[PDB]
Amino acid sequence: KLSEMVEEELEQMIRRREFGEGEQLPSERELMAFFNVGRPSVREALAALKRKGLVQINNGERARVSRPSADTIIGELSGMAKDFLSHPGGIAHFEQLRLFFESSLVRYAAEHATDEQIDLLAKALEINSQSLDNNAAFIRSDVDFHRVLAEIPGNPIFMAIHVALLDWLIAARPTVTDQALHEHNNVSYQQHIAIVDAIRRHDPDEADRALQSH
Amino acid sequence: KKLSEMVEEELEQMIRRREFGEGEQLPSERELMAFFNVGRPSVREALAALKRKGLVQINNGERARVSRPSADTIIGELSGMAKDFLSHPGGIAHFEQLRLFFESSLVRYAAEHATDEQIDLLAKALEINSQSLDNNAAFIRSDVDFHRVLAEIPGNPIFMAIHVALLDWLIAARPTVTDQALHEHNNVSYQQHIAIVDAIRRHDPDEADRALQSHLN
Ligand SMILES: CC(=O)N[C@H]1[C@H]([C@H](O)[C@H](O)CO)O[C@](O)(C(=O)O)C[C@@H]1O
Ligand SMILES: [Zn+2]
Numbered sequence: 001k002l003s004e005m006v007e008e009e010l011e012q013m014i015r016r017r018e019f020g021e022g023e024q025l026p027s028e029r030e031l032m033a034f035f036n037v038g039r040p041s042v043r044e045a046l047a048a049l050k051r052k053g054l055v056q057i058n059n060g061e062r063a064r065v066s067r068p069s070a071d072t073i074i075g076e077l078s079g080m081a082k083d084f085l086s087h088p089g090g091i092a093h094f095e096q097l098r099l100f101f102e103s104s105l106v107r108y109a110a111e112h113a114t115d116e117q118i119d120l121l122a123k124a125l126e127i128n129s130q131s132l133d134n135n136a137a138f139i140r141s142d143v144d145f146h147r148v149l150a151e152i153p154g155n156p157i158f159m160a161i162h163v164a165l166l167d168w169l170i171a172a173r174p175t176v177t178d179q180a181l182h183e184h185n186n187v188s189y190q191q192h193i194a195i196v197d198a199i200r201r202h203d204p205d206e207a208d209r210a211l212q213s214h
Numbered sequence: 215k216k217l218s219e220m221v222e223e224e225l226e227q228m229i230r231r232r233e234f235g236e237g238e239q240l241p242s243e244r245e246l247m248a249f250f251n252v253g254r255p256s257v258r259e260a261l262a263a264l265k266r267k268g269l270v271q272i273n274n275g276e277r278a279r280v281s282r283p284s285a286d287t288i289i290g291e292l293s294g295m296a297k298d299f300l301s302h303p304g305g306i307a308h309f310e311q312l313r314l315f316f317e318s319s320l321v322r323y324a325a326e327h328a329t330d331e332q333i334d335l336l337a338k339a340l341e342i343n344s345q346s347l348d349n350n351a352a353f354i355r356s357d358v359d360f361h362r363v364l365a366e367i368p369g370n371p372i373f374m375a376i377h378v379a380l381l382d383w384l385i386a387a388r389p390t391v392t393d394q395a396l397h398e399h400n401n402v403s404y405q406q407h408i409a410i411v412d413a414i415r416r417h418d419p420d421e422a423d424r425a426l427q428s429h430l431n
Contacts, residue, residue, distance in 0.1 A: 016355060017386060071293070077376055078289045084372055097373045100323075104315035140231045147227075153315075157308045160295050167283050175236050175282070 002037045003044035009035070010045060014054060014065050025055065025063040085172035098165045099212070102149075105162075106195055106211050107204040109152045120148045121196050125189070135178075138185035145192045217252050218259035224250070225260060229269050229280055240270060240278040267291055306387065313381050314430045317361070320377070321410060321426045322419035324367045332367050336411045339363045343407055347400040350390050358382045360407055403429075 013019055026034065031042045046063055049055045053072075055063040084090025109117070124144035131137045150162040170176070194210035225246075228234055241249065246257045261278050264270045268283030268291070283291070299305040324332070339360040346352040361381050365374045391399045406429040413422035 017351060073379060074289065074293060077379060078285065080375060081372055082285045090372070093370045093372045096368065096370050097376070100316055100319035100373065103319045103322075107318075108315070136232070140233075143227065143230050153311070155308055155311050157295065157299055157312065158315075160292065161312065164288050164292050167288050168285065170282060171285050171288065178232075178235075181232075 002035075003041040003048070006031065006035050006037060006041055007045035007048045010049060011052075011054060014067065019065045021065055021067060023062045023064040025065060027062055081168070082172065085169070091169070094169060098169075101162065101165065102211060103208050105149050105152070105158075106199065106207040109149060110199045110202055110204040110207040113152050113199055117148075117152050118196070118200055121145065121199060124148050125192055125196060135182045135185065138189050139181065141192065142185055142188050145196075149195075216256075216259075218256040218263070221246070221250050221252060221256055221260035222263045225264060226267070226269055229264075234280050236280055236282060238280055240280060242277065306384070309380070310384055310430070313377075313384055314427070316373075316377055317364070317381075317430070318423055318426055320364060320368070320373075321414065321422040324364055325414045325417050325419040325422040328367050328414050328417075332363075333411065333415055335363050335366075336360075336414065340404070340407055340411060343400075343404040347397050347404065350396060350400075353400045353403070354385055357385055357403060357407075364410075 010025075019025060025031075025046075028039055028042050028046075031037075031046075032039060035042070046055065046057060049063070050057050053066065054068070055065050057063045081094065084093060109121070113121070124147075125141055127134070127137045127141065146162060146166075147159060150159045191210060191213065194213075195207050198204075198206035198210050225240075234240060240246070240261075243254055243257050243261075246260075247254055250257070261270065261272065264278070265272050268281060268287030270278040271281045272278050296309070299308055328336075339356070342356040343353070343360060346356040358378070358381065362374070362378045365377045368374070390396075406425065409425040410422060410429065413419075413425050
């Protein structure tokens with residue numbers, strides 16, 4: 001069990017950046033005095049770290065830390081984020097994460113959007129008088145509103161982030177029906193109108209409140 | 215820029231607006247060429263991108279059928295997007311601003327909702343900042359932990375894990391200042407952390423937001 005404990009502490013020390021990305025790990029003898037454990041426990045812990053891919057060890061050299069890659073960190077977070085959606089409280093936690101992003105977007109637009117950008121937002125809400133399918137018009141207005149909103153700050157990754165957050169939720173649910181989208185879109189349209197009204201008034205507090213009115 | 219990208223974007227928007235439903239066949243390549251007035255190579259590139267994005271399914275050489283991205287496709291797309299942007303000079307700045315937008319909402323939340331116990335957790339994190347001003351590694355750990363304490367205030371385990379992982383990557387990625395600059399550089403970060411906590415103690419979200427923007431802008 002001692003070997004598991006030095007393994008866990010060494011893994012945490014690696015994540016805490018107490019060791020860089022070099023051969024930085026101490027020798028076996030130092031690890032023994034550091035933890036007050038025997039050479040077998042130290043040897044076993046190092047072997048487990050190597051099998052996990054956390055260190056490189058050659059020919060009785062000193063271990064070299066190899067931090068988890070971007071893909072493994074991302075893989076862990078994404079599996080966590082995906083699993084939570086199967087629980088009702090996971091859906092609530094993920095909606096709040098999305099809300100944090102959308103709050104900052106609507107507050108930023110209210111304080112920084114030019115008149116040209118505000119007109120772009122309002123145009124996204126413009127429903128044609130001759131529109132034959134009002135439900136389709138609301139779906140179109142919904143997509144177009146969020147694209148303009150997410151692009152206002154000029155950051156080229158924001159739009160992909162916003163779309164990924166909605167896609168993430170949709171992917172865990174069975175396909176949305178046309179009928180349920182209709183009442184959701186009607187609700188969304190009202191909330192978008194109030195947000196744009198607040199952005200026109202350059203009022204971030206009002207914009208945030210229209211977003212959160214639930 | 216490219217004609218194929220223009221066809222890609224318009225087709226994606228049409229898919230997301232349900233101008234094509236979920237599961238039906240997209241019009242044929244020939245129909246798409248006339249619809250957009252582009253050549254077949256542009257249509258094929260566009261459809262290939264839509265397949266990569268999980269917006270269409272094309273199996274065993276069939277015609278494209280509208281689908282929706284799975285979790286793995288979404289993750290793959292975000293990871294490819296981040297690698298493309300980070301390969302440009304200064305691209306990491308786009309993610310620094312991403313962290314800032316999320317943390318702005320977090321500190322506003324903290325100012326309105328933090329309990330007295332949560333404020334004490336924050337004050338304790340400031341103490342570890344003050345004791346770490348002369349070691350880069352230690353101060354970076356104290357800096358990350360300070361923002362972790364903030365990120366735990368909502369009680370949201372998904373936001374906290376992702377947000378902290380993001381800022382931890384960003385803070386540790388910045389090249390280290392020289393030894394002579396280090397003490398005062400860390401002190402600037404520490405003083406700004408105090409101002410964030412002070413605004414949260416006064417339950418003033420506007421003040422907390424302003425202190426956060428001086429910290430990260
Ligand atoms: C003077 C200065 O720029 N300090 C910055 C520090 C350092 O970049 C970091 O500690 C590595 O030295 O990071 C922050 O605290 C942070 O990202 O949370 C913001 C702060 O503005
Ligand atoms: Zn900081």
